[PDB]
Design a protein around this ligand. Structure first.
Ligand code: NDP
Ligand code: DH1
Length: 206
């Protein structure tokens, strides 16, 4: 009773797997973030009555997010931090590891719970990303590929889009992406601030 649910990772990355700069993003795409929100927030209407998704993130990402947008509304927030001092993420769940976060959720949101969990997302940190990619329940990646080798100092842990991983990670069709997400999603290349990018969904068998 601590694994009956697969994990989905969401991230925006450059063609050289760059995902961050000085504890922040070296780019600024309001539409991209709008996509992030939709994806992590969406829950089938019928289930939306008492079900919510979960966003798991590292402490650094939690701090790197503006207060005005924290905590992520309409979603259950859980911050991963290995030395459990104190947080502050208003009733915001705290966990010292990925599995510790899962167990806390399954115990905090069980059958007697008026609030049920729908989907569990991993959204923050290159460090957390490393743990997720090694986790046996991580089978899906919502990736936003940025076609620009922007200078970054932090990188994604595994080259899922490269040949060496082509037998494990596969890129789904757009139709299947919109289907999993729940609604229609912009197809093709998008140009926001001199940058070209597009949405892709990748999966691997567990
Ligand atoms: N391009 C994108 O989509 C995204 C980019 N980013 C970027 O990633 C960079 C920050 O990366 P990074 O520092 O790694 O961020 P993290 O958020 O992962 O920060 C790591 C800290 O979080 C905790 N943590 C992470 N993984 C674990 C674990 N497995 N077990 C226990 N604690 C863990 C620890 O907390 P403590 O120190 O409290 O113990 C650790 O110090 C930035 O540039 C940021 O913007 C972030 C999200 C998305
Ligand atoms: C560090 O990357 C992010 C920066 C801001 C951000 O907004 C969160 C609050 C406002 C929108 C909302 O309410 O959801 C979210 C992220 C993480 C992120 C962005 N894009 C993609 N493709 N993956 C992510 N993990």
């Amino acid at each position: 009773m601590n694994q009956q649910k697969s994990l989905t990772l969401i991230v925006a990355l450059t063609t050289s797997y760059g995902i961050g700069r000085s504890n922040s993003l070296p780019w600024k795409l309001k539409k991209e973030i709008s996509y992030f929100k939709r994806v992590t927030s969406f829950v089938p209407t019928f289930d939306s009555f008492e079900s919510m998704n979960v966003v798991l993130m590292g402490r650094k990402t939690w701090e790197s997010i503006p207060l005005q947008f924290r905590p992520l509304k309409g979603r259950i927030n859980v911050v991963i931090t290995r030395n459990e001092s104190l947080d502050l993420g208003n009733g915001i769940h705290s966990a010292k590891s990925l599995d510790h976060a899962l167990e806390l959720l399954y115990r905090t949101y069980g059958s007697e719970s008026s609030v049920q969990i729908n989907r569990i997302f991993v959204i923050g940190g290159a460090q957390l990303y490393k743990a997720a990619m090694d986790h046996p329940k991580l089978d899906r990646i919502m990736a936003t590929i940025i076609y620009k080798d922007i200078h970054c100092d932090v990188f994604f842990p595994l080259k899922f889009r490269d040949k060496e991983w082509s037998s494990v990670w596969k890129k789904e069709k757009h139709s299947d992406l919109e289907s999993w997400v729940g609604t229609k999603v912009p197809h093709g290349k998008i140009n926001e601030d001199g940058f070209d990018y597009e949405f892709e969904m990748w999966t691997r068998d567990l």
